[PDB]
Structures are given as structure tokens and as C-alpha cells.
PDB file of C-alpha atoms and ligand atoms in Angstrom:
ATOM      1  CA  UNK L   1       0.000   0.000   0.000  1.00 55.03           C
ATOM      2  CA  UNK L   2       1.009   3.463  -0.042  1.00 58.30           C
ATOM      3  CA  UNK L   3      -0.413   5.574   2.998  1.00 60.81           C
ATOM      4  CA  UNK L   4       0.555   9.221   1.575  1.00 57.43           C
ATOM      5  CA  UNK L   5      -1.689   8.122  -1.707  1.00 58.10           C
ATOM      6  CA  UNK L   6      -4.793   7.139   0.400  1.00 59.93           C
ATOM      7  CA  UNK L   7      -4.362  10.016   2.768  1.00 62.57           C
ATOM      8  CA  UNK L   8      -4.574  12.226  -0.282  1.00 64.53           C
ATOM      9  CA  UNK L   9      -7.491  10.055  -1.796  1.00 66.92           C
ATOM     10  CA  UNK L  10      -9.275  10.202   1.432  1.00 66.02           C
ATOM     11  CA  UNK L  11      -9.542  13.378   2.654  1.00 66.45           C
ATOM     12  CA  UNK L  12     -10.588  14.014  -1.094  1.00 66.32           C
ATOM     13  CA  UNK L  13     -13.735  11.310   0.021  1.00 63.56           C
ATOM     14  CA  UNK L  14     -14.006  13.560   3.470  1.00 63.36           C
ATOM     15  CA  UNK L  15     -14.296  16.437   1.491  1.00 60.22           C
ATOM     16  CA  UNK L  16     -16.963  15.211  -0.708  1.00 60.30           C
ATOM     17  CA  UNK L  17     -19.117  13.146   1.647  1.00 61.16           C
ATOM     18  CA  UNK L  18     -18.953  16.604   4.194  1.00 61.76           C
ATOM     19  CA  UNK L  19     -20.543  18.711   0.870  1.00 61.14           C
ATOM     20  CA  UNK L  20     -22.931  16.455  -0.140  1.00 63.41           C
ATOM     21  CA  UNK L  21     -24.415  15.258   3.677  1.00 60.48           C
ATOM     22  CA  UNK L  22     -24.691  19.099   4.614  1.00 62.65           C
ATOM     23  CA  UNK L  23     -26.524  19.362   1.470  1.00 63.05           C
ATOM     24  CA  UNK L  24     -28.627  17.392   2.913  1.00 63.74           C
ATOM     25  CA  UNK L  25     -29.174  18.635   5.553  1.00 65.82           C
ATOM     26  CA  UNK L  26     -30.596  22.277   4.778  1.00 66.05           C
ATOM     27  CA  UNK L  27     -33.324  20.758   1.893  1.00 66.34           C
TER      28      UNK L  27
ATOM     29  CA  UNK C   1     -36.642   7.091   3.008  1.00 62.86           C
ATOM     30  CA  UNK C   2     -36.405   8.703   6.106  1.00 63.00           C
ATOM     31  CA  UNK C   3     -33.787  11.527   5.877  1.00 62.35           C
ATOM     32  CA  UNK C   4     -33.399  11.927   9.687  1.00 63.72           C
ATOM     33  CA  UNK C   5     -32.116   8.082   9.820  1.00 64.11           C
ATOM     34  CA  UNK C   6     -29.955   8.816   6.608  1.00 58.52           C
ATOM     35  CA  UNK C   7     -28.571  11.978   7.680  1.00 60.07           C
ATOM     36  CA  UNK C   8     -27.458  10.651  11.341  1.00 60.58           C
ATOM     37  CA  UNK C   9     -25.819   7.841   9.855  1.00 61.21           C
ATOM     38  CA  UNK C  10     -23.944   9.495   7.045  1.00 62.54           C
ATOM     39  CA  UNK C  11     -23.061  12.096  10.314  1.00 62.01           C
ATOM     40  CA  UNK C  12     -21.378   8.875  11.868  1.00 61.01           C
ATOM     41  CA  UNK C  13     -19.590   7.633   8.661  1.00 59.93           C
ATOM     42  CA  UNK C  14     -17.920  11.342   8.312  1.00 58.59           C
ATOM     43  CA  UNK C  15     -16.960  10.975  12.179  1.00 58.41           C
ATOM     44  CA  UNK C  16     -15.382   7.914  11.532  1.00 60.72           C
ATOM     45  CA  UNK C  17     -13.591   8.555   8.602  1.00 60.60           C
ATOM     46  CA  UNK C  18     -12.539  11.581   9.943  1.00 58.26           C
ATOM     47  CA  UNK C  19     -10.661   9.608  12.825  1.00 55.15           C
ATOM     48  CA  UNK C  20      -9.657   6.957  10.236  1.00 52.66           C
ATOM     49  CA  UNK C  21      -7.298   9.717   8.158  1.00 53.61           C
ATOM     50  CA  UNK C  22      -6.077  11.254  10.959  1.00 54.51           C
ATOM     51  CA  UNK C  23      -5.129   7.663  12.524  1.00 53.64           C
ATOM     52  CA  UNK C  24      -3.431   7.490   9.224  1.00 52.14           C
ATOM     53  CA  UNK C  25      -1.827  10.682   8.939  1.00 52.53           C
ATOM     54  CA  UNK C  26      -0.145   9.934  11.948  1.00 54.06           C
ATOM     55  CA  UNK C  27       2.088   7.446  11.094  1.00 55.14           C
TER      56      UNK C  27
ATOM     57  CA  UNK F   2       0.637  -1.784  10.498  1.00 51.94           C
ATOM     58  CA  UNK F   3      -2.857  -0.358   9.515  1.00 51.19           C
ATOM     59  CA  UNK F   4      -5.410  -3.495   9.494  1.00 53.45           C
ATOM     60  CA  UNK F   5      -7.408  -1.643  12.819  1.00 54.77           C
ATOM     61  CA  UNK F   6      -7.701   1.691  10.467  1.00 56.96           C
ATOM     62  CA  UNK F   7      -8.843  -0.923   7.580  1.00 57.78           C
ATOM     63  CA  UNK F   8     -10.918  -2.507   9.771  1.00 53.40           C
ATOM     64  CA  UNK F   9     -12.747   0.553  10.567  1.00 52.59           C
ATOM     65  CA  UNK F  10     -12.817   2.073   7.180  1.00 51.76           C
ATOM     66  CA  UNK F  11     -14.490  -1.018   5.692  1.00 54.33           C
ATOM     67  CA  UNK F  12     -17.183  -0.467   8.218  1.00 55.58           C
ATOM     68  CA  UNK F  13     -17.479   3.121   7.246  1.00 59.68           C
ATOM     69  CA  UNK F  14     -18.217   2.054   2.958  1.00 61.29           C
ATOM     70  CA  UNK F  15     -20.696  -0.652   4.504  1.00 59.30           C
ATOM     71  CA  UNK F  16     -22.334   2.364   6.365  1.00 55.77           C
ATOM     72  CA  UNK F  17     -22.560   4.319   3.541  1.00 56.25           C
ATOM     73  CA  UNK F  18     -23.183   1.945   0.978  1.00 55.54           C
ATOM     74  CA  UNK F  19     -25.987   0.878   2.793  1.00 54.78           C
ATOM     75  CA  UNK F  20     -27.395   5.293   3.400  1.00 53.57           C
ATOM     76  CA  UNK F  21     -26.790   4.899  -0.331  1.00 52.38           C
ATOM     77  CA  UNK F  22     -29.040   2.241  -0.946  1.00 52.58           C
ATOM     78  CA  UNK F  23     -31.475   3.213   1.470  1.00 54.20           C
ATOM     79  CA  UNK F  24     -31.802   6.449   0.051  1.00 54.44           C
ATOM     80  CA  UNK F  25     -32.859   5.046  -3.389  1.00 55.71           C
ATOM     81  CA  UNK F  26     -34.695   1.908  -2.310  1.00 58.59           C
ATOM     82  CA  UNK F  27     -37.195   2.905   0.447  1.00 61.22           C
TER      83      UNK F  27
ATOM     84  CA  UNK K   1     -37.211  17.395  -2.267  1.00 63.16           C
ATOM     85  CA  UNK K   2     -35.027  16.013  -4.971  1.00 64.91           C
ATOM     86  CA  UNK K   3     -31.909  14.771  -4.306  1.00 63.82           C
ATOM     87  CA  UNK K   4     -30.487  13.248  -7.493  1.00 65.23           C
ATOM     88  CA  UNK K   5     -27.389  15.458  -7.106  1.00 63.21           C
ATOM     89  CA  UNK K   6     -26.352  13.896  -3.792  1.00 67.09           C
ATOM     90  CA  UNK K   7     -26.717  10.703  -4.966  1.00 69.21           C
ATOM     91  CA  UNK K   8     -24.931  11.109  -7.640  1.00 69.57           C
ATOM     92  CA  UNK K   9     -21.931  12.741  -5.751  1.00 67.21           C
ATOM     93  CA  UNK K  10     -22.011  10.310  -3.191  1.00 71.29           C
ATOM     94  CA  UNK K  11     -21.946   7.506  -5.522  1.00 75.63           C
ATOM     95  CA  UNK K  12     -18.350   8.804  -6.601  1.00 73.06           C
ATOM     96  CA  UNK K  13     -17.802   9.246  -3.020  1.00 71.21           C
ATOM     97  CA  UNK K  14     -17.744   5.337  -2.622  1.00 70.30           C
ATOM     98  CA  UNK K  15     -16.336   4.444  -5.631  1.00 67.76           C
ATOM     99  CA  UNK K  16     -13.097   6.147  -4.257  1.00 67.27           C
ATOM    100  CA  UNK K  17     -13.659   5.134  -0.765  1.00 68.05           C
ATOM    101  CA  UNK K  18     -14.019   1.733  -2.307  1.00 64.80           C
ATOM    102  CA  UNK K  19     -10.910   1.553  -4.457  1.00 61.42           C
ATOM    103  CA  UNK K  20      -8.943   2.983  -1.343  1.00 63.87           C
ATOM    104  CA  UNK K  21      -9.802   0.245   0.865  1.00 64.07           C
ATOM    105  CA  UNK K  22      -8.692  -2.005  -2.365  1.00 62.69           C
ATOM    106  CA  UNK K  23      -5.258  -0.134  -2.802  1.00 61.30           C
ATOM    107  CA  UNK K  24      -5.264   0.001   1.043  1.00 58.06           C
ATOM    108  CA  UNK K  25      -4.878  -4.310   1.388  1.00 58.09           C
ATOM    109  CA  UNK K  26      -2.446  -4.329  -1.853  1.00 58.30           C
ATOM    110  CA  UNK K  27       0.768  -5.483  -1.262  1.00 59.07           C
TER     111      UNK K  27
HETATM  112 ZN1  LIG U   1      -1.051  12.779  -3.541  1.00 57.57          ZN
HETATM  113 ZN1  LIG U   2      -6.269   2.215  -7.148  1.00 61.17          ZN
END
């Protein structure tokens, strides 16, 4: 594996997930 | 669907993959 | 090295796999 | 009301939370 990739990758998935859930969450 | 059930549980995913990357960016 | 932070991570795309589907199927 | 555009998003959110939990167990 290669832990700085995921990190990267991850917080990219953290930052996503966070826009689209408070999204949500004000309709 | 109910969005209340939806919305607390995507709440706890983002918690816990919050505490999964910074697990990981502390190696 | 990092199976506990797989561990956990696998249960966090079964989570919201599952918010996914239950968004679109009920 | 609708929420096609979450979906969507968070669709891509688990494909790459998916294929990092892949490239996370390679090697
Ligand atoms: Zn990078
Ligand atoms: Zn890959």
C-alpha cells in the first residue's frame, strides 16, 4: 500500500461526503 | 426514506472517517 | 501496520453503501 | 425534495472510498 496516496485520496472522500451530507441537511 | 435516519448515519460515517485519516496521517 | 484503520474504514463504505441504498430503495 | 445530485456525488464518493480500501490491502 502506499499511505501518503490514500491520505490524499481520502480526505478528497471527506471532502466530498462533508458537501454532499450538509446538502442534505438544509433541503 | 427517512432523511433523519440517513442523515445521522452518514453524520457517523464522516466521524469515523474523519478519525480513520487522521489515525493514518499519523504514522 | 494499519489493518485496525482498515478494519474501521471497511465499516465506514458498509455504512454508507448501505445510506446509499437506502436512500434510493425505500 | 429532490436529491439526485447527492446521490450522484455520493456515488463517486464510494467508488473512491471503495478503491482505497482495495489499494489500502495491496501489497
Ligand atoms: Zn497525492
Ligand atoms: Zn487504485
Amino acid at each position: 500500500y502506499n499511505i501518503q496516496k490514500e491520505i490524499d485520496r481520502l480526505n478528497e472522500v471527506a471532502k466530498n461526503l462533508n458537501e454532499s451530507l450538509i446538502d442534505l441537511q438544509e433541503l
